[PDB]
């Protein structure tokens, strides 16, 4: 089993979070990952692209737990799976879990919707603002409901 799943923007706004043991979600764990990533940017050594990733490129860090993540480009989004000490079996489970999440995300055209909602005035709220949860609320609850 893995520990947590999180989807968030480079600005720190959270689109989705999941804790496997039903426990209160730990922002502290995700924040220790992010702050490590800022301090130590990735190199070739952290790269993971194999059959278990469905041809997506991931990166894997150890925070002294493990964090396997994908950085989507359009729009800019982090998808991260956390877990315990590495084994053969757990690096497979996590890698297949993340590739699955992305395929399911992309099947629900969530990335495309976010980009569309940013265009023009039609989705602006009463503060003249485009809220990233604007008009993807129903697609997100469907993403929820496959977990």
């Amino acid at each position: 089993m893995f520990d947590q799943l999180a989807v968030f923007t480079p600005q720190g706004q959270v689109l989705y979070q999941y804790n496997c043991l039903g426990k209160k979600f730990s922002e502290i764990q995700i924040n220790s990952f992010i702050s490590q990533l800022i301090t130590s940017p990735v190199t070739r050594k952290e790269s993971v692209a194999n059959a278990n990733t469905d041809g997506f490129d991931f990166n894997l860090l150890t925070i002294n737990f493990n964090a396997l993540f994908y950085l989507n480009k359009q729009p800019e989004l982090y998808f991260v799976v956390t877990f315990a000490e590495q084994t053969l079996e757990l690096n497979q489970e996590t890698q297949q879990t993340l590739a699955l999440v992305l395929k399911l995300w992309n099947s629900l055209h969530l990335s495309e919707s976010i980009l569309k909602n940013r265009q023009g005035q039609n989705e602006k709220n009463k503060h003249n603002y485009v809220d990233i949860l604007q008009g993807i609320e129903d697609d997100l609850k469907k993403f929820e409901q496959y977990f």
Binding site: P10, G12, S35
Partner: protein, 191 residues
Amino acid sequence: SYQPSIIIAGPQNSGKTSLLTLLTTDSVRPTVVSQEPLSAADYDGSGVTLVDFPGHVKLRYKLSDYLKTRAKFVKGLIFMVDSTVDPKKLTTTAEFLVDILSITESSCENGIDILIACNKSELFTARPPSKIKDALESEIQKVIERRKKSLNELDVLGFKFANLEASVVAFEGSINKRKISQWREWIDEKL
């Protein structure tokens, strides 16, 4: 020319992304550590942009670069802190604030007005805003003396907030309890 703007800055964990989220959506939502700035252009139709800058030491240059290009168009800066931090442990926070003031006071004729936004007011160990401000002022004097003694081994600025050209006010708030009326009045003055 640039669009007028108001800047939200300060240490990690203070509540900057939380405030911009509340101001723009009327809701309190989960956040994590920021790696890039968050902007709201033409806020409430006023022509003014609100921008939240990451607080991580290694990303401070984003705010410095923005002030070098745009300081003449900035209407105010909000310096946010977690009110529960021990007021005898403010060195890193005071270094950040004095580094901001060196730029704001020197890049404009009358400086840039500062709100010290003392967040998390509902927590038991939250300290009063006038005590935080007095503690920061004291620690900034110590930072300046340390830097002067090292240089023998900030001329635009002992140190007192009152002697700055810009105004500096400190008010409590709570984002989680939706209790930020004095901050919203200050913003409405600068818009």
